[PDB]
Symmetry: D2
Subunit: 298 residues, 4 copies
């Protein structure tokens, strides 16, 4: 005889997803664009809309959309991180029924066109070299926490990669390799915690450079990777060493193996000339590192 | 910093996880001329008892993701697949009993929805058609020395009712332009996931089917009149309470409803009168709501 | 380089992915037809391209408005009749239209049932092959109607092989008399100008022919010596059983299911565990027409 | 219904999505060309379909093997030359082949740079337009080569309108002399049989013409009176500046950006916040050819 008495609400969450818009800014003839996709989710201090059919405290998801568009118009978007902070602060300062707010934003990667070294006043091209995103979240009476990241970042090096000295058992057929293609799709996300004493765009760029440089090694010789997992650690340690603002960094590496096609039966000798990617199944590894000092201090 | 560099000393590993994703295969079973298929997609992830592969470049304890794939295929061949839940349990148990360096294993499985073809009510011995009316999945996970926990679910389940839906009496402020509505199309894409915890005294396929029926029936109401929904959130609660009322084996149920609004096109400027005849779906932006309900007795009984 | 040096070989424009649901009520009982419509025009002039002169251009926005107005005024008895109505509207209304093509696909909503009782107003999405149609007309030429089914995925676990094929120095494929036959089908058939029949009944009849020819009889099935032969069996079955079909195109995109070699893993895979190859993939395509219909042009 | 009553209008088969990377080393410096290849054949007979006789069928598996062997033996100087090599191989090797078509697209790997210094062996995926080419040949006919760029998304925030279009009772679109012009481009051009040039240099030249004609000069831009006129400006720019292009097809799929009405929200939106409409969407397409090239057939 199952009633509300027997049942606990563990979690209730709602929001508006994929709010797409472009913020246009004009300085005379020169146009500036920031196109974004925004998700904003709320947890309310009550669940009457679920438990009783009573919508009294529910802010319509339509109103969440309107608030995002109004703030874009009124505040502009200097950085997606500042815009995410503004949205979270709006919900927390305005609505007592909001226990928690989270805003996710990703940039549409528009770049200004150039003709013969001259930047175009109002013409752009889509150049996805890794999607910039950020995330702000706040519990009522808790810290406002900001994360930034880069996803759908596909990096490949054609050498200075192996995987040797791994655990062997009766189901292990993988050969030892000291030369292979290292191809990874990266999801990288880092927390600034509460710190905001810096330029969000400059620090995002600095973290991106650390990820590319740690992945590749120096351009004249590169650097040997003994595993996907070690490359993830090199990226994380490089970011933490060079960017003090990063408190916690998560890196997910989804890899594609490139197989040297055996062409003996086709009367041919394939000396790492023709390689076929395996898209599925695929390996993943994931690590989150945090500074001892930041975790201790809570 | 006051250091030119962080070292292992300054850093904590909060999480390390690796695995094999999208292991696709079909398990074929023959009873004379009659063929039976189970095609699945499997993901298996491990956490090891150390992170030396990350911290030191030492792969001694790393089970190749290739070996994870080989083990999944061997177990499919040796054990068969009576249910994806039993197969996920078998995979988790294999990793825990075989590899001392495994601290944690998680197996996710989804079924390719093959249905046997029929001609004039007669089942075909060996011919199938793909019919995605909601993707069946399950998830098993175990910490070393902890419970083996099994969840089942259905995702990409798209349900629509053309009436008996409104949203009224919501909070109003200066940015609220949404009108009150007591008649609209309720169109939802559902993700539903439920925990059996450690309980296994039942047929996984029969109970999965029972939960699916509860979801469709609670969404729709009775076939002769339906049932009024005063919000997406209330419909989620009706689905959850229906499952919890009718299926004692479900301890915890999560439901996510991603909705599409269908707008009655204003056709006045085109010289005609649209009386809820032509409606245009809004795919983005879209609303979502999510609720997880659990039995007090099951949650209490854990620590 | 000027207008003088250049020929316009082709000019075409239109509105894509017009999505809407047409709701019809018979008391408490609701009926839905949700569709995605594309409508394309060729104009008798290209001044909008060649001179920057939009005088004859029907805005793509107007194409959308016309599709929605016709849905409201006429209803949708069948997507084929709706595609005919759209093509006729553009041809009879706009002298600047040289050519119109309307593509329509159905969102595959099915009415929910509880204990064998149909629900008055509740539906579930069941994509077991997308129904579509295409109507096209050149100015004062025939209005031609095609219907079809795409994203139709059929699989049989035996009664399939591929043997006796051409061998050369780059041919490693073994002969096989037992394999899984798994195909994603695109099927499209022309009624030409004929309209003396129920579009929904004939569509259903063609779908049944495709499933039955693919599968063979349910007690024993039927051996397929190639993907290409299975395509021919489907086409000949449709042409035999559905006189209204004049021309039928079938595309079969196949997935090979490989019996995993498990010798190195210390066991024996007797066609028990098979791994699908999604890419690269084989395709074959055939279009058959009735002599009578082709001759009579 | 038998073979007697039916004509085969078309038979075609092939291998789709052959993915591989061709690696080339000059000491420490690595060069990559990763491609996706489709190769389709029409055979001189249809016995595999009509009779269940596979004697002349080249397995699609052999098509894959041939593509990989040619990549290994010849390298890939350009995807156009590789597509030519594949077509020539099938025509010279197999007398049962009536027709061959090879489609190739590049995976857009770019070499990584650190402060202007190229990395010897490290790359990043940067899809700013997918490069493709297509070669086709009928037995005893010319080997024809086309090159192109697709999924090219360009946007300008002004110097775009659409005015003076045809009005009727279903036309609600207002006249506009200022709007965002946002287009996803598919561009494809024919060299015909001509091959007296560097395929990579000419591809780059055509890409620059497309960007420059779309944008106009960087200090003022150039007014577009329609999507259709912008397509014409791109085509005429390519034809003016690249003599090797004989025929050019351009498809523009547009997204309208709507200035959100914010009056009800107590706000004044002066082209500050714009929401893109992804569906439905307008398209226009034009193919232009040189008189000289078309006449000379
Ligand atoms: O670097 C690697 N890490 C792994 O865990 C793995 N498994 N197979 N190959 C691999 N390579
Ligand atoms: O049922 C509804 N719940 C919501 O939270 C909501 N927001 N806008 N419309 C809505 N409808
Ligand atoms: O039935 C088949 N037809 C083909 O053309 C083919 N090519 N490889 N395998 C094949 N199987
Ligand atoms: O430039 C344009 N061309 C068209 O054909 C059109 N239709 N609506 N808007 C349009 N804009
Ligand atoms: Cl540029
Ligand atoms: Cl290798
Ligand atoms: Cl530190
Ligand atoms: Cl069936
Ligand atoms: Cl049902
Ligand atoms: Cl068998
Ligand atoms: Cl086989
Ligand atoms: Cl006939
Ligand atoms: Cl770079
Ligand atoms: Cl505008």
């Amino acid at each position: 005889q199952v009633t509300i008495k027997d049942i606990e609400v563990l979690n209730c969450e709602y929001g508006k997803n994929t709010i797409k818009f472009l913020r246009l800014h004009r300085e005379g003839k020169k146009h500036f664009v920031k196109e974004v996709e925004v998700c904003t989710h709320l947890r309310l201090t009550s669940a009457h809309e679920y438990l009783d059919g009573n919508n009294s405290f529910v802010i319509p998801t339509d109103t969440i959309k309107n608030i995002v568009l109004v703030l874009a118009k009124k505040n502009g978007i200097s950085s997606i991180e500042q815009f995410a902070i503004d949205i979270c602060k709006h919900f927390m300062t305005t609505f007592c029924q909001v226990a928690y707010v989270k805003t996710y934003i990703q940039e549409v990667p528009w770049q200004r066109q150039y003709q013969n070294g001259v930047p175009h006043i109002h013409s752009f091209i889509l150049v996805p070299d890794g999607i910039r995103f950020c995330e702000a979240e706040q519990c009522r009476n808790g810290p406002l926490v900001v994360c930034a990241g880069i996803k759908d970042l596909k990096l490949m090096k054609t050498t200075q990669s192996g995987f040797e000295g791994f655990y062997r058992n009766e189901h292990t057929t993988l050969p030892e390799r000291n030369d292979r293609i290292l191809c990874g799709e990266f999801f990288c996300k880092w927390s600034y915690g509460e710190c905001r004493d810096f330029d969000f765009d400059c620090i995002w760029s600095k973290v991106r450079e650390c990820i590319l440089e740690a992945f590749s090694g120096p351009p004249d010789c590169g650097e040997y990777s003994p595993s996907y997992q070690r490359t993830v650690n090199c990226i994380q340690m490089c970011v933490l060493s060079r960017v003090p603002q990063v408190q916690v960094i998560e890196v997910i590496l989804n890899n594609n193996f490139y197989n040297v096609v055996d062409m003996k039966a086709l009367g041919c000798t394939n000396d790492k000339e023709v390689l076929v990617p395996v898209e599925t199944p695929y390996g993943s590894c994931a690590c989150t590192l945090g500074r001892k000092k930041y975790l201790e201090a809570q």
